[PDB]
């Protein structure tokens, strides 16, 4: 469709299918959950009765005592040693089909356009690597929680936005569904949009 600009009011051409498709709630949710799971590292491990320090000696003989039958001090029902099902270090990453991942991005991009959370502008650069310049260039635009998605990574822009936490700068390649949804506004560049069109296809 046509993407209205706010500064040049220059027409932009974008494939209807990849920016006007319905919003697949179920597909987007599954991708977001998958992305969150992939972020984990599963760095957790416990010790079962086998791995607990101690010995296999029976604390007392197995009959005649007026006490319950015990086999070792490492039993899970015993203090200081146990854990019936000790955790192991495991990966929580989930496979997501390439088409499913691409389909989700198209749905999110379509939704953002509909909710006018996506703004297309011309080149967005800073003459010097100073955070003030970036802050001023956003205050006049009335943007507080924005994702500066640029066609090419620029060191001056990258350094300027590094300190700011509500402002994040990324390349088209470095985009994830979670970041796109989380950030209140996303401002693209003409080149960034063009490269998004082709690699989405």
């Amino acid at each position: 469709m046509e993407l209205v600009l706010k500064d040049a009011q220059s027409a932009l051409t974008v494939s209807e299918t990849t920016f006007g498709r319905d919003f697949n709630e179920a597909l987007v949710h599954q991708v977001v959950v998958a992305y969150a799971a992939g972020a984990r590292q599963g760095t957790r491990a416990q010790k079962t009765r086998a791995e607990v320090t101690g010995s296999g000696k029976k604390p007392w003989r197995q009959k005649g005592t007026g006490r319950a039958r015990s086999g070792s001090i490492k039993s899970p029902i015993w203090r200081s040693g146990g854990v019936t099902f000790a955790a192991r270090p495991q990966d929580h990453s989930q496979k997501v089909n390439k088409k499913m991942y691409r389909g989700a991005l198209k749905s999110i991009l379509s939704e953002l356009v509909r909710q006018d959370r996506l703004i297309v502008v011309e080149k967005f650069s800073v003459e010097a690597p100073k955070t003030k310049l970036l802050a001023q260039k956003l205050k006049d635009m009335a943007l507080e929680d924005v994702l500066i998605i640029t066609g090419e990574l620029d060191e001056n822009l990258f350094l300027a936005a590094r300190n700011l936490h509500k402002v994040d700068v990324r390349d088209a390649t470095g985009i994830d569904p979670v970041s796109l949804i989380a950030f209140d506004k996303v401002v693209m560049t003409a080149d960034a949009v063009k490269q998004v069109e082709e690699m989405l296809a």
């Binding site: 007392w60 005649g64 005592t65 007026g66 006490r67």
Partner: peptide, 17 residues
């Protein structure tokens, strides 16, 4: 607070045979 270590052998039971 050590639990009793030495438990004596039980007294032999009366022969019910």
């Amino acid at each position: 607070n050590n639990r009793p270590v030495y438990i004596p052998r039980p007294r032999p039971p009366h022969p019910r045979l």
